[PDB]
Amino acid sequence: HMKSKLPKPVQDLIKMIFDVESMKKAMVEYEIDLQKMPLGKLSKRQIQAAYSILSEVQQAVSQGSDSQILDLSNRFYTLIPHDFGMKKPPLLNNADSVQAKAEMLDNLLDIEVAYSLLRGGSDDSSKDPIDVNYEKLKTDIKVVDRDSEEAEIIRKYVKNTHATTHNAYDLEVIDIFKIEREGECQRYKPFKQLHNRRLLWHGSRTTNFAGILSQGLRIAPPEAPVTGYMFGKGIYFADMVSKSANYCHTSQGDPIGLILLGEVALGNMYELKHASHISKLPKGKHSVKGLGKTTPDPSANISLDGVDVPLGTGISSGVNDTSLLYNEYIVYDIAQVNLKYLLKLKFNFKT
Numbered sequence: 001h002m003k004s005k006l007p008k009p010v011q012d013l014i015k016m017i018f019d020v021e022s023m024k025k026a027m028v029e030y031e032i033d034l035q036k037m038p039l040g041k042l043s044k045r046q047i048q049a050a051y052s053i054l055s056e057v058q059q060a061v062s063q064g065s066d067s068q069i070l071d072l073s074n075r076f077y078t079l080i081p082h083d084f085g086m087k088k089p090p091l092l093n094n095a096d097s098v099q100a101k102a103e104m105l106d107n108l109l110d111i112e113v114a115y116s117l118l119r120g121g122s123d124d125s126s127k128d129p130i131d132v133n134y135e136k137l138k139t140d141i142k143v144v145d146r147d148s149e150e151a152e153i154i155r156k157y158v159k160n161t162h163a164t165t166h167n168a169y170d171l172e173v174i175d176i177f178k179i180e181r182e183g184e185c186q187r188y189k190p191f192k193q194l195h196n197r198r199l200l201w202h203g204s205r206t207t208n209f210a211g212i213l214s215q216g217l218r219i220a221p222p223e224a225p226v227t228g229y230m231f232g233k234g235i236y237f238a239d240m241v242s243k244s245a246n247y248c249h250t251s252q253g254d255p256i257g258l259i260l261l262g263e264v265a266l267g268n269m270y271e272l273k274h275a276s277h278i279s280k281l282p283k284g285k286h287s288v289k290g291l292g293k294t295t296p297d298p299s300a301n302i303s304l305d306g307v308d309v310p311l312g313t314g315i316s317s318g319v320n321d322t323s324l325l326y327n328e329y330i331v332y333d334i335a336q337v338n339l340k341y342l343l344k345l346k347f348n349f350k351t
């Protein structure tokens with residue numbers, strides 16, 4: 001092939017995000033049976049149907065036994081095959097079981113997107129597949145220069161917002177990319193001047209990123225159980241890098257993660273301390289803020305292209321009986337996000 005003139009970091013990013021074997025590995029991690037439900041047989045309607053059954057299982061547990069539950073739990077396993085051999089699979093009988101399976105289905109949706117991009121499309125040997133795959137993202141990806149002002153600000157954000165309670169690892173920024181999802185800026189226009197626009201973190205596993213860059217960050221579908229998400233079906237962000245970085249699900253086999261920085265249009269925040277499984281905001285509110293016990297020092301907010309960057313070190317928020325150790329931000333309309341940066345991170349696991 002012609003060999004590809006994309007910068008080396010952008011090429012390594014494309015290789016990571018389209019890696020078929022990482023997809024399979026993520027699926028086997030969820031205890032999916034690849035013999036019965038392989039990567040290519042995965043589809044939107046089957047995932048949607050699984051989401052619905054999980055909503056039924058949600059319904060049964062809300063209103064209380066292990067007898068009428070058994071049936072609903074088995075029906076989940078009928079739609080998404082799990083690898084339990086000659087089995088009896090574990091009973092899905094509580095809220096933890098529902099959260100956990102709904103998070104799996106979120107990820108399968110993005111893996112299906114990634115694989116459909118690979119299998120749709122044309123085959124041409126004289127093109128570098130790195131170039132072919134890049135183009136399917138419909139995203140401009142540029143390397144940010146290590147000495148720029150924006151680089152300095154990003155690395156400070158990363159440097160100051162690592163929580164003491166997440167000290168089992170630390171992070172080094174390997175590559176910073178500036179990203180522009182096609183049409184996203186246009187989508188964001190109504191919100192672009194809104195008050196309380198903040199640059200915030202979103203971590204996800206690497207096998208979601210092809211999906212995220214082609215479709216943007218998305219809200220879970222109507223079929224998904226709203227109870228499987230602490231603040232219901234929105235798009236979730238943190239102001240502490242380590243809280244988002246935990247969602248990369250890195251470890252000691254797969255050490256590199258990917259994390260986003262988006263401009264999020266929060267406007268009037270609906271401030272909450274505990275789980276609230278809403279599907280719409282109170283009139284007048286534009287976001288939810290889950291109130292952390294600790295917050296980036298508000299005095300240290302700095303500005304980057306007109307957006308607040310809450311990069312102060314963590315201090316007491318003053319909030320008392322909250323479920324959350326750190327802040328969480330949730331929007332409920334996809335147009336309130338404009339993705340700005342993508343970081344490739346190395347996790348140094350101290351344990």
Ligand SMILES: O=c1[nH]nc(OC[C@@H]2CCNC2)c2ccc(F)cc12
Binds near residue numbers: 103236
């Ligand atoms: O960076 C983040 N990535 N993903 C998060 O959540 C993914 C699942 C959907 C919301 N609950 C779990 C998530 C939830 C809270 C938060 F502050 C950050 C993040």
